[PDB]
């Protein structure tokens, strides 16, 4: 007789989902929720290109290593790429104190403006011109020094006199500045460069106090130097004032950055091309609309949630049981 | 099935039915075909979509790992950072892998139940005017017009109308 | 509805059945009314209640944020703390919001299931004594006394008792 | 139960049926006994076993607490390590506890659906050849040797074969 | 015409809605709201214990003994602490409280302190202990004063500064919280006028502690007309531990210390009123008096509080889909 | 009688219950217990490698080379460390080991150490090696001794303490964990007596590290009948790096050092008083061995090895069977 039946949809779908009860279940329609695909390059985020530190490390860029002069002016970045194998960093051997806190602080920023904080004339009766090292060559000059610091030495006259400087931050922006403390290997080097007697370096602001005296001894040769320099950083808040005062061994602030304040610092091989991005990870761009990604937990911009899942395929259609021809 | 209609007592699907998820197939002297039930297909589309959108929205919260460095005296705070970031990683990988295994199960059940209810919405209309064959298929004891097939679908089937025609035919055999 | 009953073949509900979630509407020469099924209602209430308390109890533990202070040499751990605290905030906000969304879907179906199995319980009793309309309503092939109605609900319905009276009008 | 079959319209279980989760009880002129429906208990065993393995797998990851000494000038990050570690301990405790509660409710429903679908399978075969007693029990209006019992269990039961025999026996009562 | 019994379900005048994975804005006959979004904007007692109102004083101002923090002086017990945002009286003589954050955490809980004279001025033989005031630290009554918990020790009119010594063996039950300092002058003239000549030191020890600091003379920017500085310190003399002091000059001595008794504790930085009310839940932005499971007010609280989430609503259906006629 | 066919389900004598969101205490036919609360209160070998039992020594007493810790002297290898909660012999001469929490963390995560003589007593010229002994540091045999890995360098009959220098170059392949100290007398009398008069210093450096410290002379509360203190220090000399030691005085010199192999695995330190026996394990919690197949445990969140996820739960029993409604016999 006449037949009326009830049933359901089928199609040539061979796409399978998974279930708590069953595995490898073919269905009629489904949605992948995860992105496993990645342009292996770096791009502009917010239409603001990254800073490629090239052959220089973060210590090398910002302290002002002579071989990093490419990076020297002001800088505006959306993130920082630091090539892993960069060989230009702290050329005159020694420790940059609170290194990790500074890499962190530089990471927070989007812009720095270089300016001359303490002109060489700030220090009377001493030699601004003489101090440079063979451990810190420029490409052109065998002996040079950091473009942000002055290795002040005493003049031909024997005494190194108390030297003093101040800088008042009447500005609207914070100031990242550096300084240091020379530590000769010898009593002979100490007397040649600086006066006779106990020397000191001292600096202070409303919210800071620093104070150090040279520790004199031979450390193993690094860059042919058995002496060391302690480097230091700090941030002059707006409205704050810095007083500098030393009778020797001061490696002085020369140039400082007005600093504008999530951002990242990527250590990476990847190329930086003329391309835009909306999500950048440390292993590539994500040009996607998916909800999850298994690419990398380290990104900047708008990205999907990072999980270790190979697939996250939701089902939206019924089980696919088509007729067998 | 769990409701038992799909991949169950209704052994298969209709590649021939391409305008909906759930439907009717009819045969009568005027012709045969496959006609999807728009209302129960629409309501399932709105619903599954909302499920997809609900999960998408709930899942749009990222944990941001960081590039921070650590000195040779900061092993403890460094490992504290690693376990933190792997912890939220394991917690969200679980939260998604498990939700997808679960929601798929309940989605397949949802379809199985909409087929099943369509099958019952007809069977309570035909009563003994029709004979129940296998695979959720029914053979009428009377002649069913196209406008008959139409009334079964849109729920306005006239049982009394075909009662005496059916009885005479049903046990004539 | 998923089990077909609620906002399905039983199209609407009864603003007149005040005493229960699931119930019977009858009509008679003596009148018409609404009457809940205590067993299925009170067993549903028991369940829903226990779900709500299972949820509330599971959600009892808090996460304690601290608002400690950090120095200007403490940007890393001060941020480590913030990601951490907003991390658990982001997880527990998900857990709640999702659970509620899922459990709402599943609870609406429970009531659907319970209304369906009420209809099946009555249908099984009556058999061919009554005729099953589309809407979960049954038209008796006999005269059903308030005592008769009461028995359908009680689950003590005497089918043979009305069988002969029913065979007549069913075919008459 | 939710599908109404287990501890519902079927009041009790059978300590006698030892080979399956869901089954048939039959009484014959030839004899009586219990036999599990073999197709269905195997599909339930597969399905549940995968559920258990899916869960076990999803829970494979472990957060790791570590015992690191802290000094009296390290109160803040000591507590950061505690609130972090308990924080994950409270997240996993909640997952494993809510999931067990949920999946347990749902696996009871699945068992209760397989019973109801077993019974609906048989009930649609028998039609009016069999009388319905309660507890999911049918009395045949005809004879039924073992071969006939098997045919109901095997889903291959012949309704016309016994339709005449059933109809007269029904008329008599 | 036949008698009818129908099966159906409840309805009601409800307009309350819920969301499900499959549908939004589903009206339902009976629901429960699990999330609390209201609060009393004020601070109330916890466990029938009143909070501590530092008022015009910061935490530093309170426990160091700032002359203008006199109304806070003495014994205190608290259920939590409320430091106002614009509290002006803190460190009055310029300088750095070392391990400030860590001290804030230890104080933070903490439930009671008993203040007592640890080192009487009788200690420190041969030095003047009555001239150590300053225009930087006025009390309300007097122009020049000093912190009530420290003594500024200066050279006897007839020089010099001799080795001075003190000790304290802790026989009590409770840990002792104490403070001291080292003075840092702007000249060698102030240094000479106030202390001897010669190399000065301040040395402090306990069974588990070692301190050593000498002055670092230099001129810092003016703060409260002071170009000199003081480095402040805190510590905790555990029960059974002895404290040995010894100085050469430049010691700001510990005069008063707190017996310190230590649950979960809060320091709220807020400007909300403390009223004569009681509470079971206290939030940094208000009181919660509720039985609900979740709250959307604040992550920071003391007492038994609902769990904090970002959700505007968390409503569970109890009843069923509401379809009235 | 009439022929019957019934549809029904399994039941059994099981009395085992589960909870659900809708109903507590439901009896079911079959279920799995997913959580483990059983434990062996002992410590077992893990990669067939035995742990290290510091016995009556602390971590500090062990690598400084306290005299009473001679049982532990020499090379050691281990899969984890057990340190007894009331071990007496640690830092016998009163004073702080600096960056201690960070040293304990470094020591953990280290599979093994070889002990060797980094600086020989001859390294220092013009000074007295053989007087460097105290009776706050006895061995079991001699009432007055000193750590096995350090020299207390004191002065010779000539009044001056000469400048002394030492260099060690790490030729190959392994980090070296080493210790040194600065002595702080209670007196200037003791200062002058033990060391030359005038300003003193300890200075040490490497390609990447700088250390300068000067004595801090003051009278400190008696500990082990000592009012003086020593500051102890630790550091790790990387491969291909070189250490320079130089001192005017007050130097407690490095004598013996540890070649240090770090591990690929999880390092751990257990502060427990449980015992160590000749047994193997796959899971070691701080409070015992788990020997289980289950997915969760409630024993401890601290472990080394492959372990179930820890949760506070008492029980986690999943239903695999159905509701159990067996027939009522009487
Ligand atoms: C105020 C008071 O009475 N106390 C001290 C008193 O403790 C101290 O005497 C010290 O007494 C202890 C135990 O009684 C030892 O006898 C000290 O002798 C030794 C030691 O064994 O520790 C002898 C040892 O040969 C010395 N070793 C070297 C290499 O010098 C050491 C060492 O010099 C000291 O540890 C340096 O602090 O001491 C004995 O010093 C005396 C000593 O000044 O002072 C009293 O005031
Ligand atoms: C360490 O040893 C290497 C290999 O002999 C040598 O080249 C290097 O100069 C040494 N370092 C020092 C400072 O002695
Ligand atoms: C059973 O009920 C008892 C109290 O009647 C309770 O302690 C237990 O947690 C429940 N569950 C189990 C697993 O028996
Ligand atoms: C500290 O006091 C206790 C009790 O008076 C005493 O036993 C111990 O010897 C004292 N220690 C010092 C260093 O005075």
Residue numbers in the entry:
A (entry chain C): 2 to 262, 266 to 329
B (entry chain D), D (entry chain B): 1 to 173
C (entry chain F): 1 to 172
E (entry chain E): 1 to 262, 265 to 327
F (entry chain A): 1 to 330
Quote the original article.
In June 2013, the first case of human infection with an avian H6N1 virus was reported in a Taiwanese woman. Through systematic introduction of mutations responsible for receptor specificity switching in other human influenza viruses, we found that a single G225D mutation in the human H6 HA strongly shifted receptor specificity from avian to human type. To examine the structural features that underlie the specificity switch of the H6 HA G225D mutant, we determined its crystal structure in both apo and complex form with human and avian receptor analogs.
3′‐SLN binds in a cis conformation similar to its interaction in the wild‐type HA with slight changes in Gal‐2 and GlcNAc‐3 presumably to prevent a steric clash between the Gal‐2 6‐hydroxyl and the aliphatic part of Asp225. Consequently, the distance between the Asp225 main‐chain carbonyl, the Gal‐2 6‐hydroxyl, and the GlcNAc‐3 3‐hydroxyl is increased (from 2.6 Å and 3.2 Å, respectively, in the H6 HA wild‐type complex, to 4.6 Å and 3.8 Å in the mutant complex), reducing the hydrogen bond interactions between Gal‐2 and GlcNac‐3 of 3′‐SLN with the G225D mutant RBS. The G225D mutant lost all binding to avian‐type receptors and now specifically binds to human‐type receptors.
